[PDB]
Every structure is written in structure tokens, then in C-alpha cells.
Amino acid sequence: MEALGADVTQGLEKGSLITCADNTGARELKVISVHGYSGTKNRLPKAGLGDKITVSVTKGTPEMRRQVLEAVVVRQRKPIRRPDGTRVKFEDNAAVIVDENEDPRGTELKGPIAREVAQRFGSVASAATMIV
């Protein structure tokens, strides 16, 4: 993929429960896999900011629940490093549901976003309320 323009310490694992920052109808999401990743023996597969993950819907509307969909990580508690040395961290862990073409499934995003996510998913960013 295109370079993020920042270093990321993955703060999420396979099985992690995170926040779905949108209005698709899904509230809580569970990470199942990370696109393009292949780890090593005994290592629990990891995900972080700017990564595209496969997810299952834990909470939300009856229809959205149990559905296996794709998503993009937008915010994470573990710190990341900007090119100027400064560290940046968020209040929670969140991702936005997305389709085959990387276009947000919902109509609106809930909460802030990392400027770095724009360099990868412009159509997701071009729906952002706040880009920090």
C-alpha cells in the first residue's frame, strides 16, 4: 500500500473488540483478520492505524449483527510517531465499515480521525468531521 507517513505500534489483535465510528447501524466490532498480514509462529496477528481489517458485528441493529464485513482503523489508544518526533494518541479504538472499493458503507463518521488515514482512504477521510 501507499506509505502512511508515520510509524505505528499496532494496538489491536485478532479478537479485539472496538468501536464502530459511523451510522451504519453497527456499534461494536470484533477484529477477525488483517489484510495483507502474515505473522510468525505463536504470534497473535496484529492491527493498527491505517490498516484494513476483516470484522464481525458484535452489537447493533438486528440486521447488521453477525455480518462479516470489512473496515478501516481510524483511531487507536497506543501512540504513533509523526515525522517530527511528536507522539499522538486517541481516547479509544475505532474503525469505520467499508465496502469492496474502500468507500464507507455509512453516511457519516463519529468522532475525530488521524490525518494519516486520508493518504490511504480518501473517500473515508472525505466524510470526516474532524481530522487531527
Partner RNA sequence: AAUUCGGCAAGUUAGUCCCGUACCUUCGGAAGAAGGGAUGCCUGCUCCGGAACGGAGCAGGUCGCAGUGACUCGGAAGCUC
Partner RNA sequence: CUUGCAUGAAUGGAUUAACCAGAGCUUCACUGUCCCAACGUUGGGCCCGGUGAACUGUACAUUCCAGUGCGGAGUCUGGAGA
Partner RNA sequence: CGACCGAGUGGCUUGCUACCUCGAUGUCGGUUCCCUCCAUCCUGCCCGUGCAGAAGCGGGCAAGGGUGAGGUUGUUCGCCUAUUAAAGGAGGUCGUGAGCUGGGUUUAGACCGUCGUGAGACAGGUCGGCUGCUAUCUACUGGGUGUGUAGGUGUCUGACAAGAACGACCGUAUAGUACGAGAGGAACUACGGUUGGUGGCCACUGGUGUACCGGUUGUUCGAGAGAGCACGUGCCGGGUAGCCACGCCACACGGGGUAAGAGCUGAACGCAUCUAAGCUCGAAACCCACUUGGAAAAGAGACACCGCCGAGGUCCCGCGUACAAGACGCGGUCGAUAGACUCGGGGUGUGCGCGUCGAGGUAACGAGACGUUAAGCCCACGAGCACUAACAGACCAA
Residues near RNA, by CB under 7 A: 1-4, 7, 9-10, 13-15, 32-46, 54, 68, 70, 79, 81, 85, 87
Which among other proteins, Cl ion, Mg ion, none contacts residue 33 (Cβ within 5 to 8 A by kind)?
Cl ion
* Closest distance of CB 93 from RNA, Å: 14
Closest CA to 53 of 119, 3, 121: 121
Cβ distance to other proteins smaller for residue 25 or 112? 112
Tell me if 129 contacts other proteins by CB under 8 A.
yes
CA–CA distance, 124 with 11 (Å, rounded to integer): 21
CA–CA distance, 85 with 96 (Å, rounded to integer): 27
Cβ distance to Mg ion smaller for residue 42 or 107? 42
Judged by CB under 8 A, the residue of 25, 54, 56, 112 near other proteins is 112
Question: What 8-state DSSP symbol labels residue 84?
Answer: T
* Closest distance of CB 119 from other proteins, Å: 9
CA–CA distance, 105 with 118 (Å, rounded to integer): 17
Closest CA to 122 of 72, 76, 78, 77: 72
CA–CA distance, 116 with 33 (Å, rounded to integer): 21
Rule CB under 5 A: which residues touch Mg ion?
42
